[PDB]
Design a protein around this ligand. Structure first.
Ligand SMILES: CCCCCCCC(=O)OC[C@H](COP(=O)(O)O[C@@H]1[C@H](O)[C@H](O)[C@@H](OP(=O)(O)O)[C@H](OP(=O)(O)O)[C@H]1O)OC(=O)CCCCCCC
Ligand SMILES: CCCCCCCC(=O)OC[C@H](COP(=O)(O)O[C@@H]1[C@H](O)[C@H](O)[C@@H](OP(=O)(O)O)[C@H](OP(=O)(O)O)[C@H]1O)OC(=O)CCCCCCC
Ligand SMILES: CCCCCCCCCP(=O)(C(C)C)C(C)C
Ligand SMILES: CCCCCCCCCP(=O)(C(C)C)C(C)C
Ligand SMILES: [Ca+2]
Ligand SMILES: [Ca+2]
Lengths: 898, 263, 90
């Protein structure tokens, strides 16, 4: 089909060579035919074209300077889907470019086309898909190659005409998709200079297309780069001859005049040409000069110069902040909202944070811009599917209050203070996709920035917990850590500036950012560092002591509690006094429980036993209220579990004693009472979390318990292993396995730790010989080993806990302080009346100050980071530039004198 | 180049080799074993330094490769060479005992994918354990993951130990009968598996102390078998019973190994 | 733990993926039965890595000194040229 059409159009000697697609063309062949064939059969229309001059040097040096530039150029072309036009020779730079393209394709989206001469190239088998392996050598690494059907084969180029015609024709076409102004950019790349290279550049000027020339490398490219730095024939003539003695020596005197004339042609038009000096600067040069080359061209057109939008969109597409900021936005002409609305929408999608910052600085009401339509479109179309899958996984497994909130928000947006909170939605959108710079830029624009930082930290942590893909988890974890430090520093600065406003900000419940204040967000993420800071601890101390002033010796307060059991109302409302009275009441209740259980537990309960029922009923009502307040948060705390277990054990004893069917039932109830007492009295240790010295003890005790739990597995394995042995070997037969086991089960579990086995050895002739190793390995080898191992673990747990003291205690104390905020500020035994009364009864500026403090903080970090380090280098650079300018001016005046 | 501690020439040549990461690991191990030699002190130190440098090179290169892409990195990890040394990079890292190389997230993720198999990660382990019993086609994939096979092996081993305890404690009279004979069948299956393990690895078998413990348990089982079978005197039967108890002690202590899965 | 877990993961790769008590039948069945591109991608990644370390090691430190040296050399050359033109004037 297509092949037959091509053959008919030419009226063949073409083959889909595979050792991509090679073709033959006549010098008079219409250019539009080539473009049509490429677009409608093989390739999609290309927004960007690059023409690299080939044939300049038969041999190419793979210098890092000359190599990385072309690697970056090929990467850029792949990114933008550009075409690259080269000679296609096997020897020289063409082979390197072909190999780079091949590996990148291995690493389709990039298209490279080569132009050759059918007469100069080696004989090619006439057409189906002939194969060739090996006066000219062609790479065939390029996907498509075209040969010039010159009448007579000859070494000199006989195809440059077709190349120039094709590039000119491609320029004479319109593509709306590209950011360029309805035209397809075409930029030359001359790095390896030569005669034909010079001729191509000269023809390029006539073609009115930009060219970029490398400096510091190339046979003739360096000559151009030096020449650019009125017009004098001698100046443009002397340098060339010196730089290339062999080239001038070979050429006749008739050639040198033509060369000088062509150089004068280059000197005629300085705007079109561009120079890239690789002696300095880093990677961006490869992508900068090219873009720069385009911009100048877009300025030459008067209609293009008329519109700011074309230049702005072009620079935004190529991501050159400096050029747009200086040349465009310095115009000072009126900048209306809709302009930056459109350019901001197109900037957000392409991940251009610096341009977003520039637009915000130059003036753009972000709240006005963030319409409901914009947000829903952004969440629907540009939300990566992988991130959505991660969200689904996170909600399915690691569900949380904040995560369910954000997932609900996203679901609402996809299918469809002020209530909207548009900036918060945008900030979440940026955060979910790990856009670090865009998220940083947007964060500065949000009121309640500290709260937003903490929310982002927790959300990113829970996202990092997911394991669907490793790469995203690490970036999310890093960003969460960064935001945690940001929030901590900002709040520390705010508190140091002022106290009352900082405290007000700390508890300021948002308009449903996540439905909670910053303190709760910090707690949920378990940020020991955030709460450990002095400001939060001071706020907690003020809440805990209440009216009572600090710097009061605690023993004085305790003494006043009893010596004096109006002004006293304030003394009776502080949480500390309520806690002390609760402790005293609980101790009294335990004392009464002990008295009742030990002495008066006869068949008739009577007053001493009944009053305990009343007390435990009050406690049960309080725990019922706690359960009612928190549907799931109740069982979250292990203390609540312990309380529930104690209640359950109390009811059993009640029932057992009440039945009183037999004295055995009463005795069982009494023993159940003792067990429930054991559970009850051990809840007292919790009230040691107030004391700084005793605070870490219960936590460290708790970690130790976890370690015991883990060590129980090993202990159980050993216990089974050697108990079954002892049973089988020591004695024969038993009342089933249970009798034999229980016979001596007491010894291995406790006696070994308590006392050495004395009768065991005596109780134990091959059996006589084999008995000794049994016991020897049984006790002295393994048990000692295991017990010591457990002891070592205890030592390490205590060591690590006590090492990090004074940070664990503060976080633990937060919960104690929080618990008493929700109470009614009444002693425990008398709060039943308050509960009954309740049952009967039932049936902006701070944000501005926060923004100011954020302003100071951002100044502090940004300026200190940049200017302090860059000042010396800037001074040297400015001094050198000024001295050079003054020297040039002095040279000019001296020339004027003579 | 590597054998003679030519640092710069070796660095230059390394960039020209395909499978550069594997070559780096091979050079690291070879230089370590060369450094172990004590014939001359001076060479050992340079060799050790070069080995450390190449270890860090390989680790960084593979980390970058994995961060760029996942599937290709995983394919590269197990890509057995055309007999560079006859083994892939993972085995070379293991032999040199490079805790750091395997500790990196990519290798651990690959191991997790291989271990869980078809079962997707981010699945609460208790749910999988519950599904094992509540449901004892789609199930074929669930039945092929190494994790499920390991869980079933653990359950079977616990059941075997329970039966061994029952037989030893209660039914060990002169006539073995079914409860004692079934244990012979089970231990025979275990013996066949260990024989296969020995056959696969001629010397690698005894390298692991666990294999030594297994062999010792087998040897202790055969002695008890012979003692009870002879039954010349009640003393022989009693000796066989005690030998059974000792072999039980060895057998039941091999269970601790299955605690290596838990972090 | 990770290095230790490697061995556990490796051990079960070689198995037949059958529960232990029933793998005897599989063993008997077995007894009866008996009787490039990735490398290119690796090279590309190595290219990026070598760029990352080499350039970051050298150019980042040497850029300031190279700038000063080039500025001094250019200024000296321009001063010499100015001296030459001044001599030519007189
Ligand atoms: C055996 C049964 C239980 C016996 C009761 C034993 C219960 C029990 O342990 O309390 C002892 C406790 C010890 O005092 P403690 O020195 O640990 O109090 C903290 C400690 O002093 C810190 O050092 C202080 O900070 P800093 O050093 O200045 O930096 C911190 O103040 P702040 O810095 O945060 O502002 C203090 O909160 O003092 C009480 O009476 C509390 C009410 C107990 C109720 C007493 C009821 C009569
Ligand atoms: C007493 C006799 C023996 C009793 C059996 C006791 C045997 C036993 O110890 O298993 C308990 C084990 C504990 O789970 P465990 O938390 O240690 O599992 C690992 C741990 O959670 C790590 O924290 C995880 O990484 P991370 O935290 O996310 O970073 C890692 O996943 P990955 O990161 O690598 O992807 C997990 O592999 O869970 C099982 O059921 C395993 C199958 C057991 C078979 C059960 C058969 C019924
Ligand atoms: C019926 C449920 C009994 C649970 C037992 C827990 C009692 C806790 C009471 P407390 O918190 C004080 C406020 C009375 C104690 C820790 C001093
Ligand atoms: C006859 C040799 C007996 C050796 C005993 C070792 C048995 C190991 C079996 P396992 O690996 C499981 C796959 C059955 C055990 C560790 C759970
Ligand atoms: Ca409670
Ligand atoms: Ca083994």
């Amino acid at each position: 089909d297509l092949v037959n059409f091509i053959q008919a159009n030419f009226k063949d000697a073409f083959g889909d060579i595979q050792f991509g697609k090679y073709l033959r063309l006549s010098c008079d062949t219409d250019s539009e035919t080539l473009y049509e064939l490429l677009t409608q059969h093989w390739h999609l229309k290309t927004p960007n074209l690059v023409i690299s001059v080939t044939g300049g040097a038969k041999n190419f040096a793979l210098k890092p300077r000359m190599r990385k530039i072309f690697s970056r150029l090929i990467y850029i072309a792949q990114s933008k889907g550009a075409w690259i036009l080269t000679g296609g020779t096997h020897y020289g730079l063409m082979k390197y470019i072909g190999e780079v393209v091949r590996d990148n394709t291995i690493s389709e989206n990039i298209v490279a086309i080569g132009i050759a001469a059918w007469g100069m190239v080696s004989n090619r088998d006439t057409l189906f898909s002939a194969q060739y392996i090996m006066l000219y050598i062609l790479d065939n690494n390029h996907t498509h190659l075209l040969l010039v059907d010159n009448g007579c084969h000859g070494h000199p180029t006989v195809e440059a005409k077709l190349r120039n015609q094709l590039e000119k024709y491609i320029s004479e076409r319109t593509s709306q998709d590209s950011n360029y102004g309805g035209k397809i950019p075409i930029v030359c790349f001359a790095q390896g200079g030569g005669r034909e290279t010079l001729k191509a550049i000269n023809t390029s000027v006539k073609s009115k297309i930009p060219c970029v020339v490398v400096e510091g490398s190339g046979q003739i490219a360096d000559v151009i780069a030096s020449l650019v730095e009125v017009l004098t024939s001698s100046m443009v003539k002397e340098k060339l001859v010196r730089f290339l003695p062999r080239t001038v020596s070979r050429l006749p005197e008739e050639e040198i005049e033509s060369w000088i004339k062509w150089l004068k042609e280059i000197l005629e038009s300085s705007h079109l040409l561009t120079v890239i000096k690789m002696e300095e600067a880093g990677d961006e040069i490869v992508s900068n000069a090219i873009s720069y080359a385009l911009y100048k061209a877009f300025s030459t057109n008067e209609q293009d110069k008329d519109n700011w939008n074309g230049q702005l969109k072009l620079l935004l597409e190529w991501n050159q902040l400096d050029l747009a900021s200086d040349e465009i936005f310095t115009n000072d002409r009126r900048w209306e909202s809709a302009d930056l609305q459109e350019v901001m929408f197109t900037a957000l999608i392409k991940d251009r944070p610096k341009f977003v910052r520039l637009f915000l600085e130059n003036g753009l009401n972000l709240q006005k811009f963030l319409t409901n339509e914009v947000l829903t479109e952004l969440f629907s179309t540009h939300f990566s599917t992988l991130v959505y899958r991660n969200l689904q996984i996170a909600k399915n497994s690691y569900n949380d209050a904040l995560l369910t909130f954000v997932w609900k928000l996203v679901a609402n947006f996809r299918r469809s203070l002020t209530t909207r909170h548009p900036l918060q939605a945008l900030f979440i959108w940026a955060i979910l996709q790990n856009k670090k710079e865009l998220s940083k830029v947007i964060w500065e624009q949000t009121k309640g920035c500290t709260l937003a930082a903490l929310g982002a930290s927790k959300l990113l942590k829970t996202l990092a917990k997911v394991k669907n893909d490793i790469n995203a988890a690490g970036e999310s974890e890093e960003l969460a850590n960064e935001y945690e430090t940001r929030a901590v520093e900002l709040f520390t600065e705010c508190y140091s500036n002022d106290e009352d406003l900082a405290e007000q900000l700390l508890v300021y419940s948002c308009e449903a950012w996540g439905g909670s204040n910053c303190l709760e967000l910090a707690v949920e993420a378990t940020d020991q560092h955030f709460i450990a800071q002095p400001g939060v601890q001071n706020f907690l101390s003020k809440q805990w002591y209440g009216e009572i002033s600090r710097d009061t010796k605690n023993w004085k307060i305790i003494l006043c509690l009893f010596i004096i059991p109006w002004y006293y109302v304030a003394f009776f409302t502080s949480p500390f006094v309520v806690f002390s009275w609760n402790v005293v009441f609980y101790i009294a209740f335990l004392l009464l429980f002990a008295y009742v259980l030990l002495m008066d537990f006869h068949s008739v309960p009577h007053t001493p036993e009944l009053i305990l029922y009343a007390l435990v009923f009050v406690l049960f009502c309080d725990e019922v209220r706690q359960w009612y307040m928190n549907g799931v948060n109740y069982f979250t705390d292990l203390w609540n579990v312990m309380d529930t277990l104690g209640l359950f054990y109390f009811i059993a004893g009640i029932v057992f004693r009440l039945h009183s069917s037999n004295k055995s039932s009463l005795y069982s109830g009494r023993v159940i009472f003792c067990l429930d007492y054991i559970i009850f009295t051990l809840r007292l240790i919790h009230i040691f979390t107030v004391s700084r010295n005793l605070g870490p003890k219960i936590i460290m005790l708790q970690r130790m318990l976890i370690d015991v739990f883990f060590f129980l597995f090993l202990f159980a394995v050993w216990m089974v292993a050697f108990g079954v042995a002892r049973q089988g070997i020591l004695r024969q037969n038993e009342q089933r396995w249970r009798w034999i086991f229980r016979s001596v089960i007491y010894e291995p579990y406790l006696a070994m730790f308590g006392q050495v086995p004395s009768d065991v050895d005596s109780t134990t002739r091959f059996p006589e010989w084999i008995t000794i190793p049994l016991v020897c390995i049984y006790m002295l080898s393994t048990n000692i080993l295991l017990v010591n191992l457990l002891v070592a673990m205890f030592g390490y747990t205590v060591g690590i806990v006590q090492e990090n003291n004074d940070q664990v205690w503060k976080f633990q104390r937060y919960f104690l302080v929080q618990e008493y905020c929700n109470r009614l500020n009444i002693p425990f035994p008398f709060v039943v009346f308050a509960y009954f009364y309740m049952v009967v009864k039932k049936c902006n500026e701070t944000l501005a100050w926060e923004g100011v403090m954020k302003e100071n903080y951002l100044v502090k970090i940004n300026t200190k980071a940049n200017d302090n380090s860059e000042e010396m280098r800037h001074r040297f650079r400015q001094l050198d530039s000024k001295l050079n300018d003054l020297k040039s001016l002095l040279k000019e005046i001296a020339n004027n004198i003579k």
